[PDB]
C-alpha cells in the first residue's frame, strides 16, 4: 500500500537475470506468509520504552504491506519469549509460507535482549545464539531453504557508540588573521 510496488514488467525482468540467484516466491493467491513481533514496554525494574507502540504500529503495517500476517506479543520474560518463539516456529502456516520475519524490540546488553523482569541480580536475558538455534532446520523444518529475517531493536551495550578525537585545521598568499600574541 504505502510501499512503492514492483511492477510486473520490472519483477519479470529482474527474475530473468539472476533467476537461480534469487529466492523463489510462492504465488500470492495461495501463499500464507507469517511474521512475529515481540516487544517489551513495561518492566519490573527497567524503565519503560515510551514510544514503542509507534514502532509496533509501523512495523505491523509494513509487514502487512509486504504480504505477511503479523502476530504481536507484548511484555514477555525470557521463558515466555522463548515459548512464544516455539509457538511461532510450530505455526502450520510456515509449511505454505515462502519466508518469515521476526522483529524483537526491548532493552538489551551484549549477552542478549532483556526480559520483563530483568535485573542485575535476577537477569532475564535472551542470547543472540538462542533465536538462531530455535528457528533453525532442526527445530523449525517448515522454513528450510526459506529466508528468515530477524530485526533486533535494542542496545547491544551501554556505551555511546562514538569516539572523539581532535581534528582542527598551498596557495602563496598572506595570513588573514589578527591577534597573534594571545
Amino acid at each position: 500500500g504505502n510501499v512503492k510496488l514492483c511492477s510486473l514488467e520490472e519483477a519479470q525482468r529482474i527474475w530473468k537475470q539472476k533467476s537461480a540467484e534469487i529466492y523463489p516466491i510462492m504465488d500470492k493467491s495461495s501463499r500464507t506468509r507469517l511474521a512475529l513481533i515481540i516487544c517489551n514496554e513495561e518492566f519490573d525494574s527497567i524503565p519503560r520504552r515510551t514510544g514503542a507502540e509507534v514502532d509496533i504500529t509501523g512495523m505491523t503495517m509494513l509487514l502487512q504491506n509486504l504480504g505477511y500476517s503479523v502476530d504481536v506479543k507484548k511484555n514477555l520474560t525470557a521463558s515466555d519469549m522463548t515459548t512464544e518463539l516455539e509457538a511461532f516456529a510450530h505455526r502450520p502456516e510456515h509449511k505454505t509460507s515462502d519466508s518469515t520475519f521476526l522483529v524483537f524490540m526491548s532493552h538489551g546488553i551484549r549477552e542478549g535482549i532483556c526480559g520483563k523482569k530483568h535485573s542485575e541480580q535476577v537477569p532475564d536475558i535472551l542470547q543472540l545464539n538462542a533465536i538462531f538455534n530455535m528457528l533453525n532446520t532442526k527445530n523449525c523444518p517448515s522454513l528450510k531453504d526459506k529466508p528468515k529475517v530477524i530485526i533486533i531493536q535494542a542496545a547491544r551495550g551501554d556505551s555511546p557508540g562514538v569516539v572523539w578525537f581532535k581534528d582542527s585545521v598551498x596557495x602563496x598568499x598572506x595570513x588573514x588573521x589578527x591577534x597573534x600574541x594571545x
Binding site: I46, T50, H107, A155, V162, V163, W164, X182
Partner: protein, 389 residues
C-alpha cells in the same frame, strides 16, 4: 568572621525542623537577604550538593506588572538567647503569595536580568522567611543594629508563560524551560529514567560519559583544569559558558588561557557545545565551586602525583562510614596504608577539616552541614582520578 560565629549560636538554640535554615554568610551582606529579596543559583547537576546562593540585590515587586512590596507578617519575638538579646522571626505566608500571584501577573517584556538568567540556566529563589533582630547590641569590635538579618529561609520560583512559587522545597525543578531538543531515550539502563548510591552513580556515570575522549584531549582537560584551579573567576566564567551551551545551546564564544584550552575539548569546528561531554565538565566545575579555597589549592598541588587514589579512597571510607547522614556519627580510619605522618598538618586532614569535619579516636564528629562539602570533595577526587589510566 565573628558575626558568622555569633549567628550560629542563635540559629542552633531555636533551630527548627520546619525546613532548611540558611545562616547568613557575610555580616555586611546580611542587609540583602530581606523578605521578598531575590537569590540566584547556577544549575545544580547533583542532588547531594547545591552551589552557594549568589545575591541578585533586587526585590520581587520589580518583575511583575505593578510596582508596589506588600507587607511582612508574624512579628514573633523568639525571646532572649544567650549575651541577652531578643530576636524576631518574620514570615510571609502562602496566603499572601497566592493572592499576589493571582493579583499581579508576569511582566512579559522582561529582558534585563530574567532573560540574562535563563540564558545562564540559573534557578531563582525568594526569601520567604527570615530571622532578624529588634535590639541594637554590642559584642565583646562588633555592633549589630535593629532589623539586621542573621538567617533566612528561601523558596524557589519558576517562570515562563506563568510565574509561581514552590513552598515545598522540591530539589528537581528548574526555573526556566531549557533547550528541550531531541528528547531521545537510550535503549539501555542509564541507572534511572536513593541515598549514597545515587552519589557514586552520579560520579561514575559522569566519568563514564567522557571515556569517549581521546587520551590527549582528556589529559589536556586535566592539566588545564589544574591551571584554572587557581583562577576562581575563570572557573565561574567557564561554568557560565558551559551552562549557556547546555541549558540554551547556541554558539559558545572562545576563552583565553587554560580555560579555553579546556573548552577546545568541548566545541566542534562549527562553534557549538557537545552536551554529552560538556555536561560532565560543568558538573565537576560546579563540584569544585563549593569546595573551600585551601582544599582546592592542596588538591591542585596533589594532581601531578598519583596521590589522589589515596585521598579518594580515604574520603570514600569517610562517606561510607558517615551513614546515617541525619545523625552526628563518627568514623574510624586506617593509619597503616598511609603511615607517613597522618597528623593534622597532613594533607588529608586539612582537606577534611575545611570540609566541615573536626588521631586514634574518630576525630571527625560528622555534622549535617558537613555533607555538602564532603559529598563534593569525594566527587572531584574521583573525576580527576578518572582522567588518566
Amino acid at each position: 568572621s565573628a558575626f558568622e560565629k555569633v549567628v550560629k549560636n542563635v540559629i542552633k538554640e531555636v533551630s527548627g525542623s520546619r525546613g532548611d535554615l540558611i545562616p547568613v554568610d557575610s555580616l555586611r551582606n546580611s542587609t540583602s537577604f530581606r523578605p521578598y529579596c531575590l537569590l540566584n543559583r547556577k544549575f545544580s547537576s547533583s542532588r547531594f550538593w547545591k552551589p552557594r546562593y549568589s545575591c541578585v540585590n533586587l526585590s520581587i515587586k520589580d518583575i511583575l506588572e505593578p510596582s508596589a512590596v506588600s507587607d511582612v507578617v508574624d512579628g514573633n519575638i523568639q525571646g532572649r538567647v544567650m549575651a541577652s538579646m531578643n530576636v524576631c522571626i518574620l514570615r510571609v505566608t502562602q496566603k499572601t503569595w497566592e493572592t499576589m500571584q493571582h493579583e499581579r501577573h508576569l511582566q512579559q517584556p522582561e529582558n534585563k536580568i530574567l532573560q540574562q538568567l535563563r540564558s545562564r540556566g540559573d534557578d531563582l529563589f525568594v526569601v520567604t522567611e527570615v530571622l532578624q533582630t529588634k535590639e541594637e547590641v554590642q559584642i565583646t569590635m562588633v555592633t549589630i543594629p535593629a532589623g539586621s538579618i542573621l538567617a533566612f529561609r528561601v523558596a524557589q520560583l519558576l517562570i515562563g508563560s506563568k510565574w509561581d512559587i514552590l513552598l515545598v522545597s522540591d530539589e528537581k525543578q528548574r526555573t526556566f524551560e531549557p533547550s528541550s531538543g531531541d528528547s531521545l531515550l537510550s535503549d539501555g539502563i542509564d541507572e534511572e529514567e536513593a541515598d549514597f548510591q545515587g552519589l557514586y552513580a552520579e560520579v561514575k556515570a559522569c566519568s563514564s560519559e567522557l571515556e569517549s575522549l581521546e587520551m590527549e584531549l582528556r589529559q589536556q582537560i586535566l592539566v588545564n583544569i589544574g591551571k584554572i584551579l587557581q583562577d576562581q573567576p575563570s572557573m565561574e566564567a567557564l561554568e557560565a559558558s558551559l551552562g549557556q551551551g547546555l541549558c540554551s545551546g547556541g554558539q559558545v564564544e572562545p576563552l583565553d588561557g587554560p580555560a579555553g584550552c579546556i573548552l577546545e575539548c568541548l566545541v566542534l569546528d562549527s562553534g557549538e557545545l557537545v552536551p554529552e561531554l560538556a555536561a560532565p565538565i560543568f558538573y565537576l566545575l560546579g563540584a569544585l565551586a563549593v569546595l573551600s579555597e585551601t582544599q582546592q589549592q592542596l588538591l591542585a598541588k596533589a594532581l601531578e602525583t598519583t596521590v589522589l587514589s589515596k585521598q579518594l579512597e580515604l574520603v570514600k571510607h569517610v562517606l561510607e562510614q558517615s551513614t546515617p547522614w541525619q545523625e552526628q556519627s563518627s568514623v574510624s580510619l586506617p593509619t597503616v596504608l598511609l603511615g607517613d605522618c597522618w597528623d593534622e598538618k597532613n594533607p588529608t586532614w586539612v582537606l577534611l577539616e575545611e570540609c566541615g569535619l573536626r588521631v586514634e579516636s574518630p576525630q571527625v564528629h560528622w555534622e549535617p552541614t558537613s555533607l555538602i562539602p564532603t559529598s563534593a570533595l569525594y566527587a572531584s577526587l574521583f573525576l580527576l582520578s578518572s582522567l588518566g589510566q
